[PDB]
C-alpha cells in the first residue's frame, strides 16, 4: 500500500503533493527516489539549501551513484558549506580514484581550508595522472612554495626543461637521418609527438623559474648560470657551451663582442637572439644584487632605460626599492627619480625612500624637499621626525630650535 501512496503523489506537481509525499515515508524512513523527487522540487522553487539537504541524504541510500555525490558536492561548494563539499567529493573519489574533476575541486577546497599536507598530496596525484597539463603544473609548483619547499618546485620546472631538450635532440637527429636515406626529408611526427611530449618551455616558463630562484635566496650564482643555460637553449644557442664558464654574465650584452671565442663564431650564429625579456632581466639584476655584485646587477637594471617608460614603471620602482634595501643609495635615486614625472607615482611610496636616500648621501638640502612633499599626502609621525633629523644636519642649530618644536 506504500507504493500506491507514493505513486499517486510522484505523478503530478503541486506544493502540497511533494511534502505529503514525505509524510508517507515519514511513517517508515528510507526511499532513495523520494529524495530525488524532493531535490528536483526545491531546486525549481529556487531555494537552494533545502535542495542540498534532501539530496545530501539521498546519496547515503545508494552510496554507489558517484556522478550523484559529485552534484551534491559541487552544490555544497556553491552554497559555501565546505566541510560537506570535501566530504561528498571524497566519496566520489573512494568510489572512483581516477575522477579528475573531483580530485582537483576537492583538493582546492583543501587549499582554502589550509590543509596543505592533503592539498599537496592532492595535486601531486593529478600531476601523476596527466604530467602534461600546464595548469596542474603551476598549481603544484605554487603549493610547494606556500608549503616552504622551493627546492622541489624548481626541480619540477627543470624536468619540463630537460624533457624539451631530449625532444629537440630527437627531431635534430631525426632529420639528420632523413637526408641520408634520401626531394626533402620527411620526418615521422606521429612517432615523435608520442615518444617525447613534455610541456613547451618558453620565456614564460623561464620567468616562472627565475622568480623561484629569487624566493630561494640561496647560492644565487647557480640560479644565474641556469637562467642563462635555458634562455640560451631557447634561441637555439645551446651550441655555445663556453658561456657557462665565464662570470661576466657577458652574453646578453654588447660585452659579448669583446669575447675571444664569440668573435671566431661564424655569422650565422652571431645573428641569433642575444637579448632577454625585461621581466626576466630585472630578475637577474635582483639575483645578482643578492650576491652584492652591484656592477653586474646595475648593467641589467640599466636595460630598463631601453624600454618604453610607461610600459615598465613598476620595474623601475622594484629595482629602486631593491637597491634601497641593499643599502646602495646613490644608485636607488636614479631609478626612483623618473617615477616622479608620471602623476600616479607621486605618493609616500616613492617620496619616502627618495628622501631617505638623499639624507643617506649627506646631501640634506634636496632631501628636505621630498619629506615635505611626502608629509603633505600622509600625516605620519615616523617620517615627520626623520624630517627633523634633516633640518638638523644642514641647518645647524641656529634658528633650527624653533622648527623642531613646531613639528
Author numbering: 131 to 312, 337 to 561
Task: Reproduce, without paraphrasing, sentences from the article in which this PDB structure was first reported.
Recruitment of Pol III to these genes requires the essential transcription factors TFIIIB and TFIIIC2. The six subunits of yeast TFIIIC are partitioned into two DNA-binding subcomplexes (τA and τB). The binding of these intragenic promoters by TFIIIC permits the assembly of TFIIIB, upstream of the transcription start site, which subsequently leads to the recruitment of Pol III, the formation of a PIC and finally to transcription. A genetic study suggests that the two largest TFIIIC subunits, τ138 and τ131, are responsible for connecting τA and τB16.
Given that our crosslinking data implicated the TPR array of τ131 in connecting τA and τB, and the reported importance of this region for TFIIIB assembly, we determined the crystal structure of the TPR array (residues 123–566) in two different space groups (P62 and P43). Starting from a construct expressing residues 1–580 of τ131, we identified a stable fragment by limited proteolysis and mass spectrometry corresponding to residues 123–566. We were able to collect diffraction data up to 3.15 Å (P62) and 3.4 Å (P43) resolution. The lower-resolution structure was solved by multiple isomorphous replacement with anomalous signal (MIRAS), using anomalous signal from crystals prepared with selenomethionine substituted proteins or native crystals soaked with p-chloromercuribenzensulfonic acid to final Rwork/Rfree values of 20.9%/24.5% The higher-resolution structure was solved using selenomethionine substituted protein in single anomalous dispersion (SAD) experiments and subsequently refined to Rwork/Rfree values of 25.0%/28.7%. The structure reveals the presence of 10 TPR repeats, while only nine TPR repeats had been predicted. Rather than forming an extended super-helix, the TPR array is instead separated into two ‘arms' by a central region that contains an extended helix and a disordered coil we call ‘ring' domain. This insertion causes a bend in the TPR array, positioning the TPRs of the right arm closer to the TPRs of the left arm. A superimposition of the two crystal forms and an analysis of temperature factors reveal flexibility at TPRs 1–3, 8–10 and residues at the extremes of the extended helix. Despite crystal contacts in these regions, the accommodation of the TPR array in these arrangements in two different crystal forms suggests that the conformational changes are indeed permitted within the TPR array.
